[PDB]
Structures are given as structure tokens and as C-alpha cells.
Amino acid sequence: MKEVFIVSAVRTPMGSFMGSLSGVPATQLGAVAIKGALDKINLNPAEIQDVYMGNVLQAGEGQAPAKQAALGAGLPNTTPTTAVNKVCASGMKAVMMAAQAVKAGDVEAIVAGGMENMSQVPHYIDGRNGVKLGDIKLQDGLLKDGLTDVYSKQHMGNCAELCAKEYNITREEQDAFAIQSYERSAKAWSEGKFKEEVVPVSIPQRKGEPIIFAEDEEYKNVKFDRIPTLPTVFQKENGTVTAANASTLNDGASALVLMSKEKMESLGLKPLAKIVSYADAAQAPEWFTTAPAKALPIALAKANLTINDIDFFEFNEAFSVVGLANNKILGLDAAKVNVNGGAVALGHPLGSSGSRIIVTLINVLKQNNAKYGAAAICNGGGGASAIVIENIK
């Protein structure tokens, strides 16, 4: 089978809910990330044969959100585009599907990534069927399509509490994990470890010069001394999950360029990394929290690798309890997982995070002179996706 290489990989900084990017539509954040990925390698945009963008909450973004991102990035109108929705796994599934397009022989160069502006998700009304007498409900699209389990009608955070109970993960352990994610995020930013992968967003102003948004803003929104006293927001009695040890709602995008060996060599491009293998797995919807621990072994077996062969891991931190549970189940050394921080501190724009953690993993491997890395992310409905990459030194 053809090899698939990652020749560029970038992300926007992540904005807080109703924060610095709340006025920049998801499709424009996608445009910034895609253009950034092309610009890193000075790639002629007409070399791109397809664009796959993860995007969970598409309402009100307008027709063909992935086309809007591609055209906004400067790709020509001859570029096909598709938006993909595997909830929080969307950006990773986009990369996997793009790799399959290369392996199937159909494209030599392809963009894959994800985008989300959670600040701009609308509320919904059934406007076509009148209500002759009675109150009418406007559903928050974030809660209805993003954060509520269909089958239980409960918030993802309630599923996080189920995980905490079953795997004996305490409030104190979740808080310590969260504090570590905040500390690692601030340290990696201070060390320049996000400078390579982050492409800034220019924000037009009503009057004056644009604001250049260049750094994640979520990880500064923390008061460490308040963390052990915050209320448990999903469960009144015997709860464990809080606003601080859960991830937040965020805005951001990410993008990667994938190529065949023949195409990258014809262009004189040295790859960042090779995609070794990938896999999806699923279990009961209420157990989406531990599905990454099912998906990663499948990807490892496809790679003919063992868990001991992986130098660094990126597991998306939808909740601190999710990070702790998958580490515990797989027996992972926490010093090798999310070493530059994770979503509890950095943020979590649903449709982008699955590709964002690949972007970060590439740079973690280079920063540590490592070889194999693995990334995995859970998703609503009970799923997870996982991918194994090889750093090319």
C-alpha cells in the first residue's frame, strides 16, 4: 500500500467561548488554518486535489462550509471539498479519510483538518409548524447537537461522572490532572513549543488596525486556589466534574497537508511525519469516555507495533476524568501523555480537536527527538478514533 506523509500541519490559537474569535466564523478559521498549512511549504494551491474538514455544528454556517473554508484559504474553485461529522473525532476522521484517498490511489495531495466556532452556534426553532396555543421552546444548538447524548438525554458531563464512578477516579485526582494540564500548557507556551504550529488570526476592527490573535487564551482562565472549591456542575451530591476540570467550549481550526511519496519528492518537500496506521472503534454511547482505549490497540495492531513502541501520546482531554481513565486502562506513563498540555487547559473546538492533537503530536515528537507517536480522541455516540504516526527526523 502507498505510504501517506504529512508535509505540513498547523492550527489557529484557540479562543474562549464568546471570546477573542467569537466574531470570526468557523469557515474563516478553517480558511486561516488551510492557508497557513499551504504557506508553511509554499505550496501551489492548485496541487490540492480535495479538502476534508471536520465540523460538528454546521447550522447557520451557510452552504458547503468546507468549500467556504477552502476558497477563503485561496484554493481555486477547481478544488473539491467535503465536511465530515464524527462529533469530537471529526478532525481526526477527516485526516484518516484523506489518507485512505491517497492509499486508494485517487489523490496525490489532499488537505484534511477541522474547524468549529462554538460561540456562533445558533438556537433552533421549528418555524414551519405553528403552535396554536402554548409556549414554544428554542433549543440551544450547542446543547442539542453537540453536548447531549441522544439515548439518555443527558449531558456528556454526566457520562464523565459515570466514568469517574466506575473507574474510581476521584475529585482530587481530576483536579490534580487539570492543574497539571494548565501548568504544562503555560510551560510549553513559555518555551516556544507552540510557535511552530500556531498560525495567527487577524481580526478586523470597526475602526483601526486589526487585532492579531496569536496565542491560546483558555489556559490563562484559571484560578488555582479556587479549583478544589468549585461546585460539581453535573451532579449535586457526590459529584467530581467541575468547570475547571472539564474542558471548555472554544473556537478554532486546524489543517494538515497529506501527500504521496511520489508527489512530495517531485515537489522537493521533506515530510514532517508518516501516517503509520489508524482505526475507529465504538462501544455503548454512555461509554464513549473509554473508547480511545479500544481504538488505540486496533491502530497499534494494524501498525504491527506495541504500546511500548510509542514514545508520546496525545489523548484529547474532553474531561480530566477521560484523560485519567484512558491512562489508567492502558497503563500509560502520564509523563508521556499530553506533555505540552491538553484540552482541559487549551480548549476544545469540537470539529477541530481531532486534527489539532495530531498537529501538536507532530511537534511533541520533534521537540523530544522521538520516533512513534499516537493520538486518540473520543466522540459522542460511543466512538473514538486513533492514529499512529512516525516522526521523520
Contacting range for its own copies; rule: CB under 8 A; set: 71-79, 173-181, 226-234, 310-318: 71-79
Taking CB atoms within 8 Å and a gap of at least 24, the contacts of 330-338 are 330/293, 330/296, 331/307, 332/307, 334/180, 336/310, 336/311, 336/312, 337/312, 337/313, 338/181, 338/184, 338/313, 338/314
Candidate ranges 62-70, 172-180, 190-198, 254-262; the one touching its own copies (CB under 8 A): 62-70
Q: What is the rounded CA–CA span in Å between residue 101 and residue 4? A: 10
| Interface pattern 57-96 for Cl ion (x via CB under 5 A) | -----------------------xx---------------
Q: Is 86 in the site for its own copies (CB under 8 A)?
A: yes
Which of 123, 155, 159, 378 is catalytic? The answer is 378
Look at residues 35, 63, 53, 37 and name the one whose alpha carbon lies nearest to residue 98.
53
Kindly state whether residue 307 participates in binding its own copies, applying the rule CB under 8 A.
no
Could you give the CA distance from residue 12 to residue 182 in angstroms, rounded to a whole number? 19
Within 120-139, the residues that bind its own copies by CB under 8 A are: 120, 122-128, 138-139
Which of residues 50 and 218 has its CB atom nearest to its own copies in the complex? Answer: 50
Q: Which residue has the cell 484559504?
A: 73
Chain centre distance of CA 271: 22
List, in order, residues 6 or more apart from 256 with CB less than 8 Å away: 6, 8, 9, 10, 37, 95, 111, 112, 113, 355, 358, 359
Tell me whether strands 250-260 and 15-16 are parallel, antiparallel or unpaired.
Answer: antiparallel
For residue 298, state whether it binds Cl ion (rule: CB under 5 A): no
Is 159 one of the annotated active-site residues of the chain?
no
Strands (E), 232-361: 250-260, 273-282, 312-315
Q: From the list 383, 386, 390, 391, which residue makes contact with its own copies (rule: CB under 8 A)?
A: 383
- Residue 65 interaction partner, one of Cl ion, Ca ion, its own copies, none, beta carbon < 5-8 Å per kind: its own copies
List binders of Ca ion among 196-255 (CB under 5 A): 244
The binding track of 311-350 with respect to Ca ion, each residue x by CB under 5 A or -, is: --------------------x------------x------
> Where does this chain bind its own copies (CB under 8 A)?
1, 18, 50, 55, 58-68, 71, 77-87, 93, 97, 99-101, 103-106, 119-120, 122-128, 138-141, 144-151, 278, 280-285, 379-383, 385
Q: Catalytic residue positions? A: 88, 348, 378
